[PDB]
Amino acid sequence: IIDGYKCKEGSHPWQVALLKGNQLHCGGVLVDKYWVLTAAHCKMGQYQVQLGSDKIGDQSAQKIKATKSFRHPGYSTKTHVNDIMLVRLDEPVKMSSKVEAVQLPEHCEPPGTSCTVSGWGTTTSPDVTFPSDLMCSDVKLISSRECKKVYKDLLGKTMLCAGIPDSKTNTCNGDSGGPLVCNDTLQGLVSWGTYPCGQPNDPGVYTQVCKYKRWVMETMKTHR
C-alpha cells in the first residue's frame, strides 16, 4: 500500500496473509471458517495462511496450512479476467475478536462509494519496502466508463476500479488478493495496477466480487 496508513488494531479481522513458507506471497480474505478468497494469480500448490494479526510474520498468530485451490475456470493468465480463487484451509479457524469472516456483498456498490483496501505490500515503488503492520488506503469506486479512459481494452466487464484523483494512495506488490471493502461488504479483490505503483490518476484494479456471487456460493457450498 502506497501512501496509506496503519490500519486500526483489529478493524480487519478478515485479513489473511498467504505465505510461501515464511514469506509474504499475497493477501486474502476470510469468508468462512474453512475458506479464504484471493486472486487467481496468487495460486500455489500450498500456502501457510496467517490469520488474526495485523503484523506480518507474527509468531503468535495462527498459521493454517492449505493445499487446495479453486480458481475461477475463466481465469486468464493473459488478460487477468476472472482473477478470483477460493482456497480451502486444512483445518477451520476459530473465530474471535481478531478473526472474523468478511460480509460478502448482496449488490454492487456504485461509483463514488467510499472504500478501504488493506495489505502488507510494499509502501514504496519501484524501490520496495515491506511493512510489519497492515496498511490501509481509502479509495473511491470509479465507473467503468471513466476507468476505460485510462486503461482502454485492458479493462474487462468484471474488473472494478478504485482510487482518488491526484493521489498516489494505491495498492502495490504484495497487496494482491486482499480485500476492498465498501459499506461493510467485500466489493473487490486486489488484481493489478500500473507500475511503478502509486501514480496519480492510475486507478487500482480489482476483481468485482459482486459479479461472482453464484460461483463463490457454488464452490463453497457444503450441502447442496
Swiss-Prot record:
It catalyses: Cleavage of proteins with aromatic side chains in the P1 position. CDD domains: Tryp_SPc. The active site is at residues 41, 83, 176. Keywords: Disulfide bond, Hydrolase, Protease, Secreted, Serine protease, Signal, Zymogen. It is an enzyme of class 3 (hydrolase). Expressed in skin and, at lower levels, in lung, kidney, brain, heart and spleen. In skin, expressed in high suprabasal keratinocytes and in the luminal parts of hair follicles. Not detected in liver and skeletal muscle. Coiled coil: none annotated. Its EC number is 3.4.21.117. Residues 1-221 are annotated as: Serine protease. GO terms for cellular component: cornified envelope; epidermal lamellar body; extracellular space. Disulfide bonds join 7-136, 26-42, 108-210, 115-182, 147-161, 172-197. Inhibited by Zn2+ and Cu2+ at low micromolar concentrations. Inhibited by SERPINA12. GO terms for biological process: positive regulation of antibacterial peptide production; proteolysis. Belongs to the peptidase S1 family. Kallikrein subfamily. This is Kallikrein-7.
